[PDB]
Design a protein around this ligand. Sequence first.
Ligand code: AMP
Ligand code: AMP
Ligand code: AMP
Ligand code: AMP
Ligand code: F6P
Ligand code: F6P
Ligand code: F6P
Ligand code: F6P
Ligand code: MG
Ligand code: MG
Ligand code: MG
Ligand code: MG
Lengths: 329, 329, 329, 329
Amino acid sequence: NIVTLTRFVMEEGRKARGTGEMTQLLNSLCTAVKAISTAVRKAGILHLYGIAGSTNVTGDQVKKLDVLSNDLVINVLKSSFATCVLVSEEDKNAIIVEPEKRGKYVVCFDPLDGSSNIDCLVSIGTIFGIYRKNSTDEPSEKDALQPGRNLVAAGYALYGSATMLVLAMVNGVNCFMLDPAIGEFILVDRDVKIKKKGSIYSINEGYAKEFDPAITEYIQRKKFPPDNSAPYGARYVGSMVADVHRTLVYGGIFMYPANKKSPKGKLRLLYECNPMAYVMEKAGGLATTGKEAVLDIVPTDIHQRAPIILGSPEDVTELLEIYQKHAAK
Amino acid sequence: NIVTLTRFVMEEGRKARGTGEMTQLLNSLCTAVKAISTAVRKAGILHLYGIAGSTNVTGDQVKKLDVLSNDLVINVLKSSFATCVLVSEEDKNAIIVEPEKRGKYVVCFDPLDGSSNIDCLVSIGTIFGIYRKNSTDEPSEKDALQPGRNLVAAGYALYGSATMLVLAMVNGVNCFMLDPAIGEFILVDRDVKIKKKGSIYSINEGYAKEFDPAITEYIQRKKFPPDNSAPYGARYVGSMVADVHRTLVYGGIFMYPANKKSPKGKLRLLYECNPMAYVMEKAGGLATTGKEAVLDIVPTDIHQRAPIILGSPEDVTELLEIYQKHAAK
Amino acid sequence: NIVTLTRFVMEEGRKARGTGEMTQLLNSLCTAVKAISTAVRKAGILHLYGIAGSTNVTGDQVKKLDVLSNDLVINVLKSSFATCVLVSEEDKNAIIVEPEKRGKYVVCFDPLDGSSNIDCLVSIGTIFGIYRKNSTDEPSEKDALQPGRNLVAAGYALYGSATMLVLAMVNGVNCFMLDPAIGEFILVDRDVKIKKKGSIYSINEGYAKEFDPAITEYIQRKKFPPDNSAPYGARYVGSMVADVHRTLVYGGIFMYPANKKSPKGKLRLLYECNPMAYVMEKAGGLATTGKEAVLDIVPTDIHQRAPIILGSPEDVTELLEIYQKHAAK
Amino acid sequence: NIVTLTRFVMEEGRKARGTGEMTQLLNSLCTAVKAISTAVRKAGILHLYGIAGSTNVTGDQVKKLDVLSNDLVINVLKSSFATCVLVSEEDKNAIIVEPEKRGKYVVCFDPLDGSSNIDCLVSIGTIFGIYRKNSTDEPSEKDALQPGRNLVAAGYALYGSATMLVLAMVNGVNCFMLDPAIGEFILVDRDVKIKKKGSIYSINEGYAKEFDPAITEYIQRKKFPPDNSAPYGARYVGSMVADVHRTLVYGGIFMYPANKKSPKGKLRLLYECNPMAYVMEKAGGLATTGKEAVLDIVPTDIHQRAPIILGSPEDVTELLEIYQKHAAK
Ligand SMILES: Nc1ncnc2c1ncn2[C@@H]1O[C@H](COP(=O)(O)O)[C@@H](O)[C@H]1O
Ligand SMILES: Nc1ncnc2c1ncn2[C@@H]1O[C@H](COP(=O)(O)O)[C@@H](O)[C@H]1O
Ligand SMILES: Nc1ncnc2c1ncn2[C@@H]1O[C@H](COP(=O)(O)O)[C@@H](O)[C@H]1O
Ligand SMILES: Nc1ncnc2c1ncn2[C@@H]1O[C@H](COP(=O)(O)O)[C@@H](O)[C@H]1O
Ligand SMILES: O=P(O)(O)OC[C@H]1O[C@](O)(CO)[C@@H](O)[C@@H]1O
Ligand SMILES: O=P(O)(O)OC[C@H]1O[C@](O)(CO)[C@@H](O)[C@@H]1O
Ligand SMILES: O=P(O)(O)OC[C@H]1O[C@](O)(CO)[C@@H](O)[C@@H]1O
Ligand SMILES: O=P(O)(O)OC[C@H]1O[C@](O)(CO)[C@@H](O)[C@@H]1O
Ligand SMILES: [Mg+2]
Ligand SMILES: [Mg+2]
Ligand SMILES: [Mg+2]
Ligand SMILES: [Mg+2]
């Protein structure tokens, strides 16, 4: 037997005895992902066929994939009639859905993460976080400022050697791989659980001069294990989706802490950190800022940044112990 | 207008007054690359059918798509009636082509490079180097033990966010992107030249305790520039084709020097180092082991390894100077 | 805005306040169609790659597309958990679904009609008819012997110049075209209605010597209009799905009456005639055996044959008047 | 092994000691055919964006995919640098290639044949005929007014249940099927030969009142065989490429003789009749107007029409004998 994302989502909706609004929401996001996947695998042939350049300027008629993807996602969520407020990396303010197409869900997303490095063909992806409209007030961007802990569903689509949709909900994480021949996501990893301890650390060491004492010490341990065990391997694709997915599948740790130029980290809280933290915790892993759990942070701005350390529970705990080791001696 | 790889190869063969053998050899590689690309984009799906039940156990790594990809390349190369000797990373001995299908080219290739990175969907690729049999003797392993400097054609196929075929010949380097809809590689970057100086360094710093003094001093200088400039950003996909292609496009430096387990480096000279070195040099970059030019090494073993440092000339030269500074002490 | 089959079916299910069982059934049939479409567009490359021949013999390991498609459809309907009894052109007896995967729906289908002429690449398709389990008895093939008039849903997938899924339900006929790039059926014709009168007649005239008086007279009228109007055009693809779809879109009439070798017509009642009659009537057209409406026939055998005349209401009525013109003078 | 069209063409060019111009011309056609095929399989979708609002109105028929397909062929042919004169069914005058892109071949083609059959998704195709400029003069329309007998290459692409490219040259006829997954045409039928006698006749019998005595007597004989054999089955897709390809594969006869509106037939001699006639003859079949061989007609108008009867030799000869029997009275 083979399970398609479409069937899995439908059956989960039925068991949840939902009204079918969330199901439509997920179906819509899935369709969006397939369209973005198709475009990504041919990005260079589009950004050139219809004029091009070397700079980074988007217009009206001819716009980059980044804008395209964002337009596609928004259009599909508004058409699902399941949302009321949308938050995107590409929009300064939150998008309030038209009353006539208004649903009860709030969606935070990164339409095409790592796109800034699409030129070198490195993996890129789409990150999403879904919230249930809490208050009865009129839809507003405050509705998208709920802590990750209130997430009903979260995940990402990774456009790497293959395209994958990782979906996490209250009962677990499942990975579905896209078969481009039939346009169907096939379940290939059920109820994923990250291993307790890994052997790979992921961080941009070019910021070494700006790292805090704890991180500086942790990296040294990975290279020079005091107990003389085997040093960890290092991997840093430069694309959050790619690095996190590898962490999820092979275990280990991924880090993007605060430093000099980034006193509060670089990764965005609403559509980058929370979703990834949610997937991690649902997989038995940890996601912390180094002092507090990411999902517990109280968001104050939709574009707020946040430090993030995540991955295997033992590796993250080890780093947590180092942070605790530092303070006011 | 829009130039397809098929048209570009044919016209180059015509200008060179070739008998068509090499043109046919290249046509065959392109076809094989498309087939591998299609398989890669759904590798996880092709699987799932009762494998065994492994987790880590340091041992077997031979994946199914690895062998199939190899068999495809071999079958396609023999069928081209343009080769006499084949060297694959998957075959312990050189493959000698039967008399009837024998041509005059020697092909060294890595069918599907990027081992520890398919299960996590990291970018992977196919690497190739082509030599003209420089002998009147009966075809044998010796015909493949030529220095990279003798290559008449070299390149790689990168299965990343998109699929790219990069071809380098005497005339220079060109990048063609695969449009999966029509099965045609479209020329998207002509006569590629590498940036004289980059701002990214690429290496697995996990082997830090095993690095020689030159590499060690170099890494520190990238993190703590003595001239107080902005430090280099770090990137290491863990897939040679992915890391090298980013070096080609964004510039900078890629490094895989000798370490404990790899006293002479890890990367294979014939089908990993040489092709990448040839591409870099045709693009105006440099490829050194730290002491000598990769392309000028005369191999004695088809599976011989070699340390490699490649990328922007100013970046590679700066490291070269460190090496000779220490050697001058 | 653009409507996908997936969304249309979901929204229709919700408005119908269904439990989601029929929705899953249609989603499953849709997925099946995409897989069959993919195989059909490459049929000749499969029936050859894995051995071949000229005869018509299927085995165990290597079976023809016909069997493949049938295996795919059955497997997908049993996995939808929405059916209890299945009737296929390829199976002598009805298939009683396993209790554990038993649903309330009865499905009659022609997995790959016109496949016998796949060799010439003529259009082929998949026909389906869906019934609601009436009695409370144990599932049996008598459950599939309901008159077409009891159809809840019916339609077909046409694999022609493009792939199309035509779905008919109580409120109308809608056509969705498959976009092979994203694996999605896009709504392209809403609530289809056949024109009142056409200008094309479709029948195999090679059976002229075996036609009854009425049909012989009707064909003469189309070629030699008594009122000297323009003679109708003739079209006969030889594939029911193709001929009917054209009739639906361009109007006119399609005929496969009884003759010599076929005293009761050739086309099957359960998975060929009824579904097409249902689509026709739902589109404002007519489907008659020449004396009685197809949907009103009381099926007595799952493989029963039946004469069928269908298409524009005025063209079919005209022929009905001719039949009435003949009897016992 | 598996032979791709790309490899088959190249090797044939090599055996012929061609300079590569014709090989490049054929490579270009193949690429264009793949692009048209992809568009065709989703033509209905490419549309939908505010056309106008027509129903029947005997007038405009020029579809959008018709022009785009034509522009593609032209652009692709000029870019091949192998042609000097082009004749398209869509251009009122011959297209003369600019000096810089001028080669020595003349190409007559029908970009997307199958007018009254795309909206109903009937099979459609692309037809082509290639001539060597047999003149030292300045390229002009005259270079295309050669008799079919002078063709150096002819064929068609059929977008049916699958996409097939049929190529005929002095050596014979070969059929290649397009694998849309890898964008390669696979040789599936080598040195095709037509059945000496078929059991299918193909004609639009709607013009019955306009048929000459020979065609009339022939049709009756197919329905009421004087030797009491089984009558021929009838087939008429309404798309020349579809009907002709079935004639090639199953054998039999295809007919489109002169009628009222078409006193000299409907089908175009240069880019419809001749290519199909050349294919038939290279396959051992016959192609006649009823009085003379299609390939021996010297055209005087590039858009000239001609009656055509083609297919199995015994079937075509039997009709030929009827024609001469009447002419002998
Ligand atoms: N497809 C689904 N998968 C998982 N949980 C679902 C699904 N549909 C609905 N639910 C759950 O049921 C709640 C109500 O669904 P709805 O009526 O569609 O808004 C959602 O907020 C989820 O907690
Ligand atoms: N398609 C081509 N592109 C570039 N150089 C070519 C091509 N075909 C032939 N050559 C050159 O011509 C030499 C002889 O080609 P061949 O006769 O095909 O073995 C090759 O070794 C190349 O140096
Ligand atoms: N997706 C749907 N589209 C149209 N009608 C539907 C749909 N789902 C359910 N229905 C109608 O509601 C009935 C009960 O649905 P169910 O509970 O799924 O068996 C069906 O027999 C149909 O008449
Ligand atoms: N690919 C090919 N297949 C078949 N015949 C070819 C091919 N290439 C060249 N020829 C033959 O050689 C002649 C001269 O080719 P060219 O020098 O390319 O114009 C053509 O007109 C054909 O008769
Ligand atoms: O170059 P840096 O500072 O390491 O940033 C890399 C990070 O930036 C992002 O692109 C954020 O958009 C992430 O995908 C990635 O992890
Ligand atoms: O894990 P390590 O030691 O950094 O090695 C990674 C390298 O190995 C390979 O996977 C093959 O040797 C390369 O693609 C990659 O550059
Ligand atoms: O060759 P005949 O007798 O006209 O039969 C054609 C009919 O047979 C079928 O193939 C039945 O399987 C129909 O698709 C088609 O309409
Ligand atoms: O409708 P008619 O007169 O039979 O003509 C159909 C013929 O016309 C064409 O559509 C083009 O003239 C051919 O493809 C087909 O054979
Ligand atoms: Mg981002
Ligand atoms: Mg390798
Ligand atoms: Mg049938
Ligand atoms: Mg035409």
